[PDB]
Design a protein around this ligand. Structure first.
Ligand SMILES: Nc1ncnc2c1ncn2[C@@H]1O[C@H](COP(=O)(O)OP(=O)(O)OC[C@H]2O[C@H](O)[C@H](O)[C@@H]2O)[C@@H](O)[C@H]1O
Ligand SMILES: NC(=O)c1cccnc1
Ligand SMILES: [Zn+2]
Length: 282
């Protein structure tokens, strides 16, 4: 806990000049159109524009701790709204352009955005989610489950069980959920495109999953304001706000960013909605 390595914190931000940003978001669109299997990896950087500080940003939880200062939350976890980027990822799964979504984020927001849980890996867990120790049944709650570290929340299982319910919030020592990690690992290896959004990729094994796509000729796009552990390995790096990149990308793909009806849980991905015909590339 005190000893835990929190990695490189507070590296300087990179801003791609606009001409270059526009050109890289078009090239990202090109790659989305050519890819059979797209997997998105997300970290704290996709929720900063909803008021949730990241970990290793200029005002990161870890960076501010390092400087003897406090992270600042502009929302509770319960009053946070999925960002343009969250709602862009909902649509890309709905139209068949997102195979799987791997997330380090415990903020609940991919679940609350209406993103289907059967295509989401929550590698570090979810604040709103508690799991029955006996039957492994997961409960998506409307408030944060009060504990962190895989402790008893004090509620019991209601499966037609009285099993101890526990939080899914891994402590520093805790191995990742075998199911989420197994499914994140498979999707990553099979992907011909892995796009990272607002993660520095500093945590093993989460941060290495995108690199798995590079085996057997897959492409890696890293979208981040700061440098990331695996920048060297990226076919494309885009230094800009994830909301600007995803809003420009959607525009290029001819998809609207859908309305957030408020907190809603989808367990299972639906059949793909219709999407625009693909452009002529070569
Ligand atoms: N609007 C933005 N647009 C683009 N990038 C952004 C934005 N805001 C922040 N970033 C970038 O987003 C990146 C976020 O990097 P980190 O803060 O390490 O988040 P993680 O999810 O990878 O942290 C992994 C685990 O570490 C912890 O121990 C927990 O267990 C976490 O789950 C930064 O490089 C920012 O520059
Ligand atoms: N977005 C997140 O999941 C998160 C949670 C706690 C602290 N910083 C970020
Ligand atoms: Zn149970």
């Amino acid at each position: 806990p005190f000893t835990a390595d929190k990695g490189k914190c507070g590296l300087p931000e990179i801003f791609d000049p606009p001409e270059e940003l526009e050109r890289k978001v078009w090239e990202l669109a090109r790659l989305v159109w050519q890819s059979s299997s797209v997997v998105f990896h997300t970290g704290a950087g996709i929720s900063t524009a909803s008021g949730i500080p990241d970990f290793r940003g200029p005002h990161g939880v870890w960076t501010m701790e390092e400087r003897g200062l406090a992270p600042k939350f502009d929302t509770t976890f319960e009053s946070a709204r999925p960002t343009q980027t969250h709602m862009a990822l909902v649509q890309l799964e709905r139209v068949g352009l997102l195979r799987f979504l791997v997330s380090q984020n415990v903020d609940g927001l991919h679940v609350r955005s209406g993103f289907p849980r059967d295509k989401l890996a929550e590698l570090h867990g979810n604040m709103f989610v508690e799991e029955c120790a006996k039957c492994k049944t997961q409960y998506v709650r409307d408030t944060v489950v009060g504990t962190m570290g895989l402790k008893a929340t004090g509620r019991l299982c209601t499966v037609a069980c009285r099993g101890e319910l526990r939080d899914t919030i891994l402590d520093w020592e805790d191995s990742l959920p075998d199911r989420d990690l197994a499914l994140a690992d498979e999707a990553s290896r099979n992907a011909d495109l892995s796009i990272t959004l607002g993660t520095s990729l500093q945590i093993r094994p989460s941060g290495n999953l995108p690199l798995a796509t590079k085996r057997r000729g897959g492409r890696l796009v890293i979208v981040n304001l700061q440098p990331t552990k695996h920048d060297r390995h990226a076919d494309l790096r885009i230094h800009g706000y994830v909301d600007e990149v995803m809003t420009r990308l959607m525009k290029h793909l001819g998809l609207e960013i859908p309305a957030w009806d408020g907190p809603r849980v989808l367990e299972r991905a639906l059949p793909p909605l219709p999407r625009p015909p693909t452009p002529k590339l070569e």
